[PDB]
Every structure is written in C-alpha cells, then in structure tokens.
Symmetry: D3
Subunit: 291 residues, 6 copies
C-alpha cells in the first residue's frame, strides 16, 4: 500500500496537479496520493521547505515525498532523490507522533524527490541522509520532458516509479554532498539578552504569528514556560505575555498568548481571535524576544 | 474498506491536514480519507456544523466523521465520540441519496468524533444518537498530546482507530446527555403571517443566499411551490418571486429565483448570476418571508 | 482499480464535493476519486473545457471523467455520456505523457460525462468520439433528482455507475451529433503577417499569460523556436523576445520569456516572477504576435 | 468684486489648479476665485455638466463660470463663451435660493466659458442663452497655447479677462446654435405605469443614490409626496417606501427614504446611514420606479 | 473684512459647498470664506467637534464659524447661534497663537452657528458662551427651506447675514442652557496609577495616533516631559518611550515617539514614518498610559 | 493685494490648514491665500519640490510661496527664506504664461519660505536666488513655537509677515550657499543612443506617466516632434509611438501618446483613457527612451 505525499507550487485552480496524479496512478496503480499542499508562493524554496521538513514522523515507513517548486524547469538541471536517515521527533516538546507513546519510525524509511535547488535544505539538516542520486534514467523520467513542466516530468513521474519499487540507486549517478544545492538559513542572533529573528510565517487560517526562534534558542537563553516575555514585531509593535503551552492559557478570548507552536518554534497569537490579520502582520518582519 | 470523512478548520495552505492524514494511514492502512472541507472560519462552531450535518446519507455505512475546530486545544477538555441513530433523509423534498429510489441507510451506522464544544449540536438534533463517549484512552489518543494540535491528537488519531475497528465503547467513559455541549440555535419566528429568520450562509462560489427557514417552516405556513413570496433581506430589500424548484424557473439570466436549496432551506439567487457578491450580502442579515 | 476524475464548479468551501464523493464510494467501493479542480468560474463552460481537454493521456485506460458546471440544473435537460476516440498527444511538442517514450493510450479508452451544455466542445474536437448517449436511466440517476444539484444527480452519481462497469450504451438513447451542444471557439485570425488572438487564461498561481494561439498557428506562419517576436497585449502593451522552450531562457530573473506552454499554446511570462499580477493583465485581452 | 467659479477635472493633488488661479489673479487682481470642484471623473462631460447646471441662482449677478474637462486639448478646437438667459429656479420644489423668499436673479447675468465639447449641454437646456462666441482673440488666450493644458489656456485665462470686464462679444466670432456641441441626454422612459431611468450619481460622501427621474417625470405619472413607491435598482435590488420630503421622515436611523433631492430629482437613501456604500451601488445602474 | 470659516460634511466631490459659498458672497459681498474642512464622516458630531473647537485663537476677532453636519435636515429643528466667551489658549503648552508672544484675543469675539445637535458641545465646554439664540428669523433663513439642505439654509445663509453685521440677538429667541443639545464626552479614568482613555483620532495624512488624554490629565498624575511611559493601545500593544516634545526626539527614523500634540493631547507616532497605517490602528481603540 | 501661495503636507481632512490661514489673515488682513496643494506624501521633499518649482511665472510679482513638509519640526532647525532671481519660462516649449505673448515677470519678484531640508532644491536650480536668510526673528515666528507644528510656526506665520511687507533681510542672518540643504537629483543617463531615467510621477487624476527626461535631454539626442520612439517602462513594458504635442494626436481614444507635458518633460499616456491605473504603473519605475 504505497503512499506518495505530494507538495507543489502548482495550485488547485486548474488540472495541473491532476495530470501529475493521473501519471502516478498509471505507474503505481495501488498508490495512495496524499496532498501536502499546492498553494506555496511559487519559487519560494524556503517556504516549500517548511511544508515538508516535519512530515516523516507522521507517515508510514516507505512513504515517498514528492516535493517541488521548479523555476529551473526545462534546463539541464536534474532532480535529486534522497533516502533520509532519521525520521526525527518534533513538536513543542520533541516527541514521536501518534497514540500512546507515539509511533517510533525506523531509520532510512523515507525518500524525498525534489528539484536540486535547495528545497530539501532543512530536510537534510534535520533528518540527515543515507544516499542521494541524480534523477536521469529514462526508466523513471521522460526521454523528451515537457520544458515548462519539470514538476511533473522530474518529480511526479519518478516519485511514482519509486513508490512502485523502482530501486532508488538506479535513478542515476550518486551525488556528492557538495552537489546537493542548499539555501542559507539566516541564524537567530543573540543581541545582549534578547533573541533576534524573523516572522517565518503567518499561520493561516488563524493569523497566528510563527517565528524562526526555536525551542533550543529559548533554552540556550534560559527562557522556559512561565517566563514573562516582551516580543517585538516589525521593530515597532511590542507584545507582553508569559510563555505558555497553548492559546487558552491567555485567559479571555482575544488576549495575547506567546507559545511554542506544534513545529517547535516561538509563536504569538490571540486566544481564539486573529492576531496577524487586523494588524496586517507579515512574513519577514523582525521578531525580537527578551525576558 | 473503511472511510474517514474529515472536516477541519486547518486550511489547505500548509501541511497540517497532511500530518493528520499520515497518522490516519499509519493507524488504518486500508482507509480512504475523504476531505469534507478545511476552509471553515476558525472557531465558528455553527458554520462547521453546517458542513457536517447533511453527510451521513451520502456515505457508506460504517463511515467515521472526523469533524473539528478546536479552540480549547491543550486544555483538560476531551473529545466526544458518538454513534448517531438516524442517517436521515434530506434535500428539498426529504429523500435518500443516490440513483433510483436512493440508498436507504441503516440506523446506528455512523460515528462522529469531535471536540466537545457544540460542533455536533445539529448532528445530534437531526440524527439523534445511540451512545456517546469521552475520548480518553491512551490506546486511541497520545499520552502526551501536542498542546496546540488537538484536532490531530484528539480527533484525527482516534478517528483512525475507530475506522480500524477499535470498539467505540472502549474510548472512555459514557457521557450523559447534559455533558455534551450544545450551541443555541436561534429559532425561526412566526410574526403574524410572516416567517422571520436569518441568512445562514452565502453559498460560495455562486453567491446564492441561504436562509435558516426550513421546508418544514414553510409547510407550517402553507407555503408550497408556486406561491408568490415576498422575501425581505437585511430589513430593506423586498424581493418578490414565486417559490420555484430551481434557478432556471426565474426565466431570463439574472432574474430572481426563490427556491428550496439542496439542504432543505429557503434560499434566494439570481438565475446564472451572483446575487450576494455584487451587493455584498452577508451571513447574519435578517430574512423575512411572507405570502 | 477504477478512477473517476472529477471537475466541477462546486468549490471547496463546503461539503458539496464530499456529498458527491460519498455517493461515488457508495456506488463503486473500489474507486479512486481524483480531483481535477473545483474552483472554475461558475457557468463558464469555456473555462471548464480548458481544465478537462488535456486529461486523457495522463490517466489509466478506463478512467471516467465527471466534468460539470450545471446552470440548467432542475430542468428537463439530461447529461451526455461519451466514449472518446483518440486519447491524443499533447504538450509543446505533441507527445505521449510519462517516463521513457511515454504511455501510449488505446483508442476508445475514456468516458466523459457532463451536462449537455457545450462543456465537452473541445474534448470532442481534439479527441473525437465513438458513441454518445443521453443519461436518463433510473439505474444510474435518481428517480427524483434534487432540482438544484444536477452536478451530483446527473454527473457524479452516473459517473460512479460507469466506473463500476454499468454498460455505457444502457444509460439512455444514443445522441446524434447535432444534439450535442457546442460553444463557438473564436478563431485565431491572420492579419497580414501577424496572428491575432486573445489571452485565454491567466496561469495561476504564477501569473503567466496563456493565449489561444496554438503551436499549429505558429507553424503555419513559419514561427519556430529562436524567432524574434513582438507580442502585443490589450492593444497597447508590446513585449519583445525570442520564442524559447522555457522561462530560464530569458536569462535574468524578471526578464520576459515568450514560449509554448505545456498545453501547446503561445504564452508569455517573466522568468521566476509574475507577469500578470503586477500589471493586472486579464483573460480576454487581445494578443497579437508577429515576427 | 468679480467672482470666477471654477470647475475642472484637474484634481487637487498637484499645483495645476493653482497655476490657473495665479493667472486669474494676475489678470483680475480683485477677483474672488471660488472652487466648484476639481474631482470629476476626467473626460466625463455628463458628470461635469451636473456640477455646473445648478450654480447660477446661488451666485451674485456678473459671476463667470469657468468650467472644463478638455480631452481635445492641443487641437484646433476653441472654447465657447456664452451669456445665459434665465438664472432659473431649482430644488425639490423649484424656487429662488436665499433667505426670505430668495434672491431673484436678473436675466443675462452669468457667463459660462468651457470647451466646446458638450459640457454646457444642460446649462443651455435649463438656462437658455442670449449670445455665444468662439474664444480666439489673443487678447484673452495665449498666442502659443500649451498643447496639453487648454483648461488653463482656453478657459482659466479668458475667464479672468471676462471677470475683469473684457467685452464678451470681442473674444471671437459669434457661434450659431448648431456649432455648439451637445451630448445626448438619455430620456426617462414610461414602461407601462413605471418610470425607467438610471442612477445619475452616488451622492458622496453620504452614499445617497440620485436618479435622473425628475420631479416633472413624477408629476407626469401622478406621483406626489405620500405615494407608496417600489424603486428597483440594477434590475435586482427592490426598495419600498413612501415618497417623502426628507431623510428623517423614514423614522428610525437606517430606514429607507425615497425623496426628491435638492436638485429636483428622485433619490433614495437610508436615514443617517449610507445606502450605496454597503451594497456597492454605482452610477449607471438602472432605476425603475412605480406606484 | 469679515471672515466666515466653514466646516461641513458636504465633501468636495460636487458643487454643494460652492452653492453655500455663492450665497455667502451674495449676502456679504466683502466676505472671505475660509474652508476649515468638508471631509468629516457624515453625521459624526464628535468628529466635527474636533475640527472646530481649536479654531478661535487663530482667527481675527469678529470671525463667524459656520459649522455643520445636519442629519435632522428638513425637520422642525432650528440652528443655534452662540457668541463664545473665551477665545482660549491652546497647544501642547497652552498659549496664544502667532509670532512673538502670540495674538491675545478679546472675550466675546466669535460667533458659531450650527445645527442644535451637539456639534458645539466641546466649543461650549472649552470656550463658554455669553449668549445663544435659536435661528428662526426669515431675515436670515429661507421662508421655504430646501428640506434636504439645512447646512445651506440654516447655517451657510444665516452665517453670511451675521458676517454682514445682522444683529445676533435678532436671529430668534434666546435659548436656555438646557435647550442646547450636548453629546456625552466619555471621561478619562484614573485606574490606580494609570490613565485610561481612547484613541480619539488617527491623525491623517501622517498616521499619528491621537488620544483623548489631555495635558491636564497628565499633569494631574505628575507626568511631564522626560517621564518614561508605557502607553498601551487596543489592550495589547504596550509601547514604551519617554514623553518628548516632538517626533525627532525618538532618534532614528521609524522609532516610537510619545508626545503632546498641537491640540494639547497625549499622542503616539513613529519618527517620520506612519504608525497607524501599517498596523491599521483605529479611532476608538483603548489607550492606557502609566509611568 | 498680496498673495501667499501655500503648499503643505498637512492634508485637507482636518482644520490644520485653516489654523495656518486664520493666522495669515490675522497678520496680513488684505492677503489672498491660494492653496497650491496639501496632499503630498508626507516627508517626501522631492515630490513637494515638483509642486512648487513651476509656480512663479503664473503668479503676480510680489507673491510669497509658503512651502512646507517639516519632519524636523520641534528641533533647532530654522526655515530658510529666499528671494529667487529668474521667474523662468516653462512648458513644453519654454515660454511666459498668460494671454497674448504671456506675462513677462521681473527678476527678484518672488519669495519662497520653507524648511531648510532640501524642499527648495529645484526652485534654486531653475530660478537661482538673490538672497537667502535663516528665519529666526521673534517678530516673524513664535517665541515659543509649537513643537509638532513648525509648518505653521516657521512657515505659515512668517510668510504672512513677509506678505505684509516685513523686510526680508530682517527675518534673521544671511545664509551662505552651502548652508542651504539640497537633495541629490539623479541624472538622466545616456546609454548608447537611449536616454535612461525614471517615472517621476503618476499624473493624477488622469493616470498619465511623467518621466524625469526633459525636453533638453531629448534635444541633446536630436529627438523632436514626429520621431518614432520606443519608450520602455519598468524594464519590460515597451511602448511605441511618435513624439506628438498632445493626446489627441494618437488618434482613436485609448491609443498611446508620447508627448512633452506642460512642465517640459517626456511623458506617456493613452488618449482620453488612463494608462497608469489599469496596469498599476508607479513612480520610480525605470523609463528608457530611444529613436
Ligand atoms: N514564470 C515562471 N518562471 C519560472 N518558473 C515558472 C514560471 N511559471 C511556472 N514556473 C515553474 O514551472 C514549474 C513546472 F515545471 F512544474 C512549476 O513548478 C514552477 O515553479
Ligand atoms: N490622457 C489624456 N487624454 C486626453 N486628455 C487628457 C489626458 N490627460 C489629461 N487630459 C486633459 O487635458 C486637459 C488640460 F488641457 F487641461 C485636462 O482638463 C484634461 O481633461
Ligand atoms: N489562536 C488560536 N486560538 C485558539 N485556538 C487556535 C488558535 N489557532 C489555532 N487554534 C486551534 O487549534 C486547533 C488545533 F488544535 F488543531 C485548531 O483546530 C483550532 O482551531
Ligand atoms: N442619508 C442622509 N440621512 C440624513 N442626513 C443626510 C443624509 N444625507 C445627507 N444628509 C444631511 O443633509 C445635510 C444637508 F442638509 F446639508 C448634510 O449636512 C447632512 O449630513
Ligand atoms: N444561482 C445559480 N443559477 C444557476 N445555476 C446555479 C446557480 N447556483 C448554482 N448553480 C448550478 O447548480 C449546479 C448544481 F446543480 F450542481 C452547480 O454545478 C451550478 O453550476
Ligand atoms: N510622525 C511624524 N514624524 C515626523 N514629522 C511629522 C510626523 N507627523 C507629522 N509630521 C511633520 O509635522 C509637520 C508640522 F510641524 F507641520 C508636518 O508638516 C510634518 O511633515
């Protein structure tokens, strides 16, 4: 019962994703295709990375992740297919997902296939990898690929072959580590006592504000649950609240909650109301936190 | 071939729904996950209720409905799992769904699992229930649930256990009727000869106007197809048309149609044009109808 | 392993598509339902046609295409079910889809079911057909169809019967060619040396501009890759670039690319930036191209 | 103490109006320049006409009206200067303006100077004229007029000469009636018992709705104050109210008032709330009224 | 050389203000009409009050203030004309306006004429008055006033008679204090050490934030220039800055300044950047200040 | 009959301009105050400069220009008052303004008073100056200036004293040329045969596009009326048209006109339609022209 989990920038306003899916079912008739999301800002590899980095612990072992924004479509570039090492714990605390104590996942149990454009940067950082190959074999890609549709030709199609049991090491030559393109992750800075980062995302549809300041950055500064924080956004808008596990800890509906989100990052919200939308807060705004 | 039909407020702009789905396939490998919708206004339990109340007659017996907006995530609250009684006929006329005379559904054939926050109010009103339990067993929920993701921990995960055949009565203790939270449904008033209600929804993507005035309210006042109606919206827009089965009965494109929608409620539209969008008509505007 | 590929105007903001899907799984328990898209402009048959015409070569033989915008819902009209002839090659070059040399598809291998309102015009033009029937049998549609939901009653339901192996010729009487409604496709004009057409679509989410000027129209005028073109939009915005296979051929990010899209049509874009959105370019604007 | 009343399409976002005013004070040092308005939709002669037709009865005898939208700037066209005949009563009732019984104005007491492009159509209809001349003398216009600024060269400048006492008949040759350009005023139609016109303006900043249905059209159909009217806008939105003199006659704040505006035309509003803005009502929408 | 300073809700998008001005020049040929502003939110008497309360010290003695929003137009209501007592100092410090030590203004030197609807509430509070009359004489208003234009009939017209020297006490009968309508001014509360008020206005076009917390409220709590303040907006934005005289005192462009505005009220801004516009801050949001 | 022509960033949404005007009439009772405009983007000295540089030739000799955006309000900075040298010809051709051959203006006939922040940069470039003084005397400014209102205290007030005949050289000490702050005017570059500049302004309310490419730049490259030009905006929207004197020379309504505007600069428009608004063209976009 193979699964392909599919993340693209193709949208859901026409038949583009469906063309990919038709080919996936053609190649691997028993496959289940699970949509991750298709609404990422086109060509924003850092955003795409956020939608795929946390996936493995949630999925059955053997799942293939087909993950693509492909602005270099129709060039001599070729996709990378990697078998990751650690499925990796996650969340506010760092745990396995599932009922009971969670579902522990075996190492080496997931494949990602993507443009070699840095989309897999955080996947490789957080999970490591056991093997990586350039995707070139005409057994798994078209001999004559559609120039403007490499997300289909060089990701969707070969992902379905991999789901069907095509040997990963036969997709093409092995890639050395330096040949796998990475984007630079801007660091969270210490600035005296304060941590200085950025709003990584507006958390739709709630309008919560997610920062790139991780639990580990907070722990490094001695900030734990209960600490009274001043969190300043965009250089201008300050908020003040204690760090709490969840939204309802802020008390009344509309009150500010500062918390660790389900991906492990410092975040700010209103309790059962939107923070971001009324004040037009945006990704890329500065985020400074201090006790 | 178990089915989980999944309705949430998690959106389709990131991997949140996919994390839930991964766990569903982990727990119940043979499951089919059917998206109901994920775009409800967050925390609007009355809107969520509208998206789930009409579902049972359309689905195979044994379907599990995983339905969630979870503003009390991370608190001591626990979900409710209920086996409904009547699958219930529906539509403008009140019938079974499907070809021929429709698919008759057996009683006691569907389970809903939801936050205990009133989301199931109309489900319980229209279908009744045979049994209801608090969802507490660590066999079906995490021992250490993610504080900000109870839609996953307390709905998605246990729904998959239920779909896999976990006995409903083993999820936790039985709930008495008064322990199942309800929202108040404002009634349709008789006001002399007129029926007085509200616009329950703008029917996207068409911009039809749906009211909370049901067929049964119309029947009570003697109003049937062919009756010349005056339907006043927002206190000031007195539209006049006969009640007709469908949009084309209004004649020319753009003309006003007053009709019974597919959920059994009095509605108003233009024939193959949008009523609501040009005039910015809104949910919560008053709706008065009279012969 | 039957597949139904489902394209509607029902949106993804409520349970409407899910009601259709529940019935599809009820009728054909082994089916896979693949969403094409549900976000087309309601009642715009020409737009719907664009989302369904290219599908067959991507899907396994035996796939049923359930394709619907149904403004004549609740009238005496009945759907048409057709078995197409040629699956048809496609793309910028005209080829089979898939890995290697592509997946050759047998003739007569796909069924479309749709309102008989011209939605299938381009399907029939590009693929031909072997047989066409009016959908009337109460074995495949409701005896008492919901007046305002013919997309469910007269498309979704009978599509599932067809996917389950109900004989196509038993759905109702054969239709003569003249009884299958067509929309008029406005032609691309030659105007001296220039080709004169329209913007057929803004290609979301990228904001590329797609025209109705086909590869075959370009070939007729001797225009091939490398030709320096002047492409004028809306009568007044001229652009100049060579015809290239893909976006990156324009060089620097933001530069103009004029290319053949993956559906075989002359298009214009910026390289990894949006052309249409900053300048509010729109479907229906004139498009003139000349060497 | 001469007055120039100045209406243009030049806006108030730069120094354009001030350049005109500087020249007016240069030519006629004792002049008072009164702004009518400068925010008309550029080139919309019918809208400009509405802002100038009602002016004369309000101003001291001898006032010059400099009124201009000049899309034919820099062509061989020349402005028209006219001395009107009747100052003309106005309002809901048809009266002189001012305290007591009002200020009766002598005939032949006002000059309009405008592009000869139909801007003065309604001025001439409602007031008549005694004499009209083409504005060509280099004593009152530049010998070398700025091509793109005829509103200054051919209206503002010569208006100041006229205000200073330059003889009207010396500005250039007399114009015959047929040489004075007119726009066509679309008529109010009788359609059975109903009057069928258009929304002539959204009355900013209040969002009242003004129609082209005049008091005289209402009188012709026997409609007077107290008559219960059904007024339908845009073919779709009906309203019902009695015809009243003013807004407060509707009773509660927000209630619909149907009234005669201060220019003599049938209008619709909410009492101390905006009608047009919440429903996005627009100029050019149809307006049908019936008893 | 009489002056009428004219504040209305009539806008500057048509000839309405000009009709008023024409009549003013008709009645008082030597008058100078000074526009205060015409863009107030219609019917918002509290906003109108803010635009007129600070005026007297800036104008020559004998100036008439014609100030009007007239939602009760066409009713039996009549305007009030008042001679104020103290011209009153103003500003951040409380001083006369002008060069040197400023222009000292004599008592009893200004007349306001307005609808008797509370528009003059703050004028009377801050300046006091010596005499007040109902405006009823047909020597100064029309015998047959236009029902929908009392801002012209009952304010503009009689203001011009007053400017021309018509005796104030002859406009109609004297009004007792209780017959002059007032709106309620919500007070600034002391709440422990903090002062609790509201954002009175967004200061356009800069987007500074003006509160109803006056210098005198600050002085009462011992707060002077240099005091480190915490100013919380909307319950959740706790800005921190010293109280400074001006914007540049915040240092770098964009930094927060907390200051006393030119009307004497506690305000917050960014230095040469907009505070309110990026964050959509609004009038009516709470404003709490504390040392 | 003195004139003050007043340009500020104070807007027209409250009484701020009126406070300034009241003081101007207080100081100089016979003055005429002419509004230039009050809607400039706050603190944008380059934009303010565009609204004041062309004024002198239009106004009577002796006019005082009070021109202000004052972001350094409340600091030790003081305004500059300058007597300009040449009134300077202007327009597409370079001429005097007015009827006949125009009104020749004597040298040394206009005074500007402004913040010393570079607002007068282009005034001084295009007109030169005879004398410049720092504005410090308490005879012409307040002894205790309102910290946040220097546009009133240090521009409006002293302008009225200057209009009233206060000797310019007594306002304070003479300023050396290097003490008068200037902004840098980016040059128009020659780039092979092409001229490379920027869109200096969107010409509201028409949506014409004004560039910083002057007649003199065109003359330098041999470009005169009749030359076929390619004008490229924003790097990517090319237009092609001959250089013509005016809009109507483009022929049909909506056609592209490339012309010299009334300020002497290369511009592009549509004939009696908006160019900028439909395509959201903006100030600061690149503008390249070539024959
Ligand atoms: N204007 C553009 N420039 C660069 N890439 C584009 C593009 N429009 C779409 N794409 C890209 O083409 C990919 C396709 F191969 F699948 C999509 O995934 C893209 O991101
Ligand atoms: N793009 C355009 N096309 C035609 N006329 C225009 C224009 N832009 C401004 N105008 C016109 O030029 C006049 C001027 F002579 F005073 C203005 O009154 C205009 O309406
Ligand atoms: N700002 C907020 N306040 C309260 N609940 C929120 C929230 N943002 C998201 N949620 C809620 O978290 C749930 C999650 F547990 F699944 C979502 O279903 C909720 O709507
Ligand atoms: N829809 C409306 N309801 C109440 N008053 C209105 C109105 N529209 C305009 N006004 C009012 O009419 C006055 C006029 F007499 F001068 C204006 O000053 C008012 O605000
Ligand atoms: N206001 C309207 N007028 C005409 N058709 C409409 C409509 N609103 C929805 N529809 C149509 O009803 C169909 C249904 F039967 F499935 C949808 O597919 C529609 O296109
Ligand atoms: N937030 C702000 N920061 C800097 N200057 C400002 C400002 N708000 C208004 N101004 C400035 O204050 C001046 C005044 F003194 F007249 C106005 O002309 C301003 O440009």
């Amino acid at each position: 019962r193979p699964i392909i989990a599919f993340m693209s920038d193709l949208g859901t306003t026409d038949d583009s994703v469906a063309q990919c899916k038709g080919l996936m079912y053609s190649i691997c008739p028993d496959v289940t295709v699970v949509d991750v999301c298709h609404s990422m800002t086109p060509w924003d590899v850092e955003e795409g990375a956020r939608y795929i980095v946390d996936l493995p612990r949630f999925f059955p072992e053997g799942t293939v992740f087909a993950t693509t924004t492909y602005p270099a479509t129709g060039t001599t570039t070729r996709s990378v297919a990697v078998r990751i090492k650690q499925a990796a714990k996650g969340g506010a605390r760092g745990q396995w997902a599932g009922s009971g104590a969670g579902f522990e996942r075996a190492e080496g149990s997931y494949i990602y296939i993507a443009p070699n454009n840095g989309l897999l940067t955080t996947v490789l950082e957080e999970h490591g990898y056991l093997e990586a190959y350039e995707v070139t074999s005409p057994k798994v890609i078209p001999e004559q690929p559609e120039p403007t549709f490499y997300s289909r030709e060089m990701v969707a199609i070969p992902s379905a072959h991999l789901a069907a049991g095509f040997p990963l090491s036969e997709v093409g030559r092995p890639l050395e580590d330096h040949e796998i393109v990475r984007f630079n992750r801007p660091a969270v800075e210490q600035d005296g006592e304060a941590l200085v980062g950025v709003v990584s995302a507006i958390d739709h549809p709630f309008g919560n504000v997610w920062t790139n300041i991780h639990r580990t950055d907070l722990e490094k500064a001695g900030i734990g649950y209960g600490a009274r924080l001043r969190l300043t956004l965009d250089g201008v808008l300050p908020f003040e609240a204690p760090l709490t596990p969840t939204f309802a800890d802020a008390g009344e509906i509309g009150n500010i909650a500062i918390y660790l989100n389900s991906r492990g990052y410092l975040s700010i919200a209103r309790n059962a109301a939107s923070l971001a939308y009324p004040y037009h807060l945006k990704e890329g705004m500065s985020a400074r936190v201090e006790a």
